[PDB]
Ligand binder design. Structure first.
Ligand SMILES: Nc1nc2c(ncn2[C@@H]2O[C@H](COP(=O)(O)OP(=O)(O)NP(=O)(O)O)[C@@H](O)[C@H]2O)c(=O)[nH]1
Ligand SMILES: [Mg+2]
Ligand SMILES: [Zn+2]
Lengths: 168, 110, 301
């Protein structure tokens, strides 16, 4: 089985851990436990290929920004996560992108833009904004809600597909 | 609560010398408030509110190293950090029932 | 001189800080890192820091939904708190962690000291059991050294934690000390433990085997401070017994800290922050004319 090293980045409180737990353990964590760095592993079949997902859950707190160089150096694909009720996190993705390109020394780094917390009625970043930003990046955009588990698999299943296309 | 007596609370004025009421009789209790789960680790306190006005005149946090001076029946005092606190009871049986709650509250501190 | 412009420290009757709070909701989020620096530096220079912390910490605890969300994000009130830890406790944190980090790098990192406790990442030549033994050995001496630094805690930081302890207590009386020790480890101690070279504690980055160990130790130290067990990673549950036995030893340190001396700002051109946001500080609502007349004289550079 081929291993795909996924890394989840984004601002603090956007749902990086709730999305990761819904993928691994299939339940919504209602608490707010800020993460330093977590690691998981999952075997899945995508497009007919059975594979292992190496997942890194990173720290959205800017106090732990000094760790970003390491996981950007070892990760293969990055799930860029922002909350649709926080404009700051929507624009925070740019600074994660630019450091990933800088560490990879490449402009084509596989990644996916993820707008979490779509279950909320008070949207701050609508769909057209993130879709336009994703086209600017050249990467897909997926709307997710770690509460109802909407698009959680689709978000992670899209990122590996970006890794596959990058390897060919 | 581990104990609930009616007694007056005393303070010790070093200039004045000796113990004086800290002024009103109060209802003094010793109780626990748990960390997280109720049946688990907790903090333990002494709390006395005057019946005059239902308002706190003394709140103390108990320690494993707390020294409890039982000088006479119906009079105990202790030392916490920089200040000295104590109570005088209306009956020696009340002084014993309150001492039973402090002895057992320290044993559960962990 | 024009130093009356620095009178942003004006305090309103039966309350306080109108100008700063208005500037708090107006200034863009990208400058909140710089904003938390200019207010703390100025206010502390005028012996009004406590009133600054009392206002900012109050707004955060009134706006929070639950106590489990307080000061665990990147809000302005949380950035002001982290800045205070950084400027008053860096010397404290440096000399507390430097001798321990020097003991792990030098005199310990040779006999293949390894802290890898994720069995999925364990090297075949290594043993999980002895690696868990190294992680707890290093975590214990680091934890004990922090709990034993009660006397050497700087008084300025002891006032920030006491202020934070009182502000939270006015809405969450039970275990309000938990938010003090959690934010203290999360935003001050553990960031320096994970990245000692970036925090200025060490001269160069520690060897890779130690960086992996310090990362896992900070996760164990954070669980102890949070008074919570490991429940997400299965390879961290083996440390739950060690974590549960150190819960109340951290609170005794936290209760000690939350109970019971700098220079001026350097060339602070505060206009830039003041003028580049001068449109919607007036709409947001009395005294704006007094400063609008001030910078009608003083031209923005
Ligand atoms: N309603 C709703 N709340 C969500 C959703 N995803 C996450 N949350 C809430 O967001 C908060 C933080 O979630 P968490 O996964 O810890 O965020 P994080 O992105 O990991 N933060 P950090 O970077 O510090 O680790 C929790 O209150 C969680 O319940 C979602 O889709 N809907
Ligand atoms: Mg997280
Ligand atoms: Zn406890």
């Amino acid at each position: 089985m081929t291993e795909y090293k996924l890394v989840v980045v984004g601002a603090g409180g956007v749902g990086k851990s709730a999305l990761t737990i819904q993928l691994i353990q299939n339940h919504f964590v209602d608490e707010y436990d800020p993460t330093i760095e977590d690691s998981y592993r999952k075997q899945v079949v995508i497009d007919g290929e059975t594979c292992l997902l190496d997942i890194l859950d990173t720290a959205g707190l800017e106090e732990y920004s000094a760790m970003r160089d390491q996981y950007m150096r070892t990760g293969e694909g990055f799930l860029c996560v922002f909350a649709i009720n926080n404009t700051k996190s929507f624009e925070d993705i740019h600074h994660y992108r630019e450091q990933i390109k800088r560490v990879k020394d490449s402009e084509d780094v596989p990644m996916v833009l993820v707008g979490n917390k779509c279950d909320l009625p008070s949207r701050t970043v609508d769909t057209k904004q993130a879709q336009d930003l994703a086209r600017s990046y050249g990467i897909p955009f997926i709307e997710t809600s770690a509460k109802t588990r909407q698009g959680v698999d689709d978000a992670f299943y899209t990122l590996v597909r970006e890794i596959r296309k990058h390897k060919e | 609560s581990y104990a609930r007596v009616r007694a007056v609370v005393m303070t010790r004025d070093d200039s004045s010398g000796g113990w004086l009421p800290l002024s009103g009789l109060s209802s003094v209790t010793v109780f626990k408030v748990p960390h997280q789960e109720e049946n688990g680790c907790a903090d333990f306190f002494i709390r006395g509110e005057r019946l005059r006005d239902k308002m706190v005149v003394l709140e103390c946090m108990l320690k494993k190293d707390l020294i409890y001076n039982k000088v006479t029946p119906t009079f105990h005092h202790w030392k916490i950090d920089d200040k000295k606190f104590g109570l005088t009871f209306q009956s020696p049986a009340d002084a014993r029932a309150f001492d039973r709650g402090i002895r057992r509250a320290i044993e559960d501190i962990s | 001189f024009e130093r009356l412009v620095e009178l942003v420290t004006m305090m309103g009757d039966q309350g306080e800080l109108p100008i700063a709070m208005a500037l708090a909701n107006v200034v863009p989020c990208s400058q909140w890192d710089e904003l938390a620096r200019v207010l703390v530096t100025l206010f502390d220079s005028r012996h009004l820091l406590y009133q600054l912390l009392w206002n900012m910490f109050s707004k955060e605890v009134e706006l929070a939904d639950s106590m489990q969300t307080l000061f665990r994000g990147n809000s302005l009130a949380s950035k002001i708190m982290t800045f205070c830890f950084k400027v008053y406790g860096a010397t404290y944190l440096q000399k507390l962690l430097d001798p321990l980090l020097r003991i792990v790098i030098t005199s310990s990192d040779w006999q293949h000291v390894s802290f890898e406790v994720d069995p999925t990442r364990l090297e075949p030549s290594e043993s999980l059991e002895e690696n868990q033994r190294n992680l707890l050995q290093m975590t214990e001496k680091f934890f004990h050294a922090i709990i034993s630094s009660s006397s050497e805690f700087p008084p300025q930081l002891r006032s920030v934690c006491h202020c934070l302890y009182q502000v939270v207590s006015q809405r969450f009386p039970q275990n309000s000390i938990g938010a003090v020790g959690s934010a203290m480890f999360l935003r001050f101690i553990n960031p320096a433990i994970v990245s000692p070279y970036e925090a200025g504690i060490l001269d160069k980055k520690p060897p890779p085997r130690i960086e992996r160990g310090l990362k896992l130790m900070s996760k164990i130290l954070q669980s102890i401070a949070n008074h919570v067990l490991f429940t997400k990673e299965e390879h961290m549950r083996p440390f739950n017994d060690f974590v549960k036995s150190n819960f109340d030893a951290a609170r005794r340190f936290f209760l000690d800290i939350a109970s019971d001396f700098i220079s001026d700002g350097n060339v602070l051109a505060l206009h830039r922050l003041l003028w580049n946001n001068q449109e919607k500080i007036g709409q947001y609502l009395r005294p704006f004319d007094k400063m609008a007349t001030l910078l009608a004289y003083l031209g923005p550079p």
